[PDB]
């Protein structure tokens, strides 16, 4: 019954920054951990980043260390993510998942997901 919708999908050039956000409405956003999952066009799922219920612990995937910056806004009940120094391998599909617990690295998995928004990293029209 919860809704996980995001925005910001589009076409950007390599080396250009793009910011994604995600709106959650169907649950209590103040005390759940949240994560980002990437769906490659010709591969399987992959975890990107995750933040705690409040911003003490932030973790990043190895392939995106020092390139992405995930934020959080509990007042507006929405989270953000910054994509910087993009290369050609970041043309995948991104989901906005929700963790069952309140920490980043726990045996609790992602219970609710949302529809993805496709992004492209190329120089075209």
């Amino acid at each position: 019954e919860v809704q996980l919708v995001e925005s910001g999908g589009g076409l950007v050039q390599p080396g250009r920054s793009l910011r994604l956000s995600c709106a959650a409405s169907g649950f209590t956003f103040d005390d759940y951990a949240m994560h980002w999952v990437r769906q490659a066009p010709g591969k399987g799922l992959e975890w990107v980043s995750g933040i705690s219920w409040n911003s003490d612990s932030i973790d990043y995937a190895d392939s995106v260390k020092g390139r992405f910056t995930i934020s959080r806004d509990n007042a507006k009940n929405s989270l953000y993510l910054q994509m910087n120094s993009l290369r050609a391998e970041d043309t995948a599909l991104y989901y906005c998942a929700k963790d069952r617990g309140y920490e980043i690295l726990t045996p609790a998995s992602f219970d609710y997901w949302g529809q993805g928004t496709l992004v492209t990293v190329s120089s075209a029209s």
């Binding site: 799922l45 992959e46 975890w47 995937a61 045996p107 609790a108 998995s109 997901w113 529809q115």
Partner: protein
Amino acid sequence: DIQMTQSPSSLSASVGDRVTITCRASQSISSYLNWFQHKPGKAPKLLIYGASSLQSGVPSRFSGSGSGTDFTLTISSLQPEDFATYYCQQSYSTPPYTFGQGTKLEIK
């Protein structure tokens, strides 16, 4: 480091068949596996959290088992609306949330 593998690659069955999918982990994870049903046209969902704990809100047709280094998932009937891609994820080892490769499933 942990490597996550899926033994089968593609299956084909009928409306009233019974199929088995297995997922092998490189190292012991102590029954901390998760299964997801990836519908190709919409957002993926979660079927079983933990070893064989059935998530509330899904039919009891699915049932899993296994602990240690081998896990198995079975579909009781495989109704025509259950064709999708399934993933196994571990959340115990140092590499966080490593997903296995897909299992495309067509009913025929």
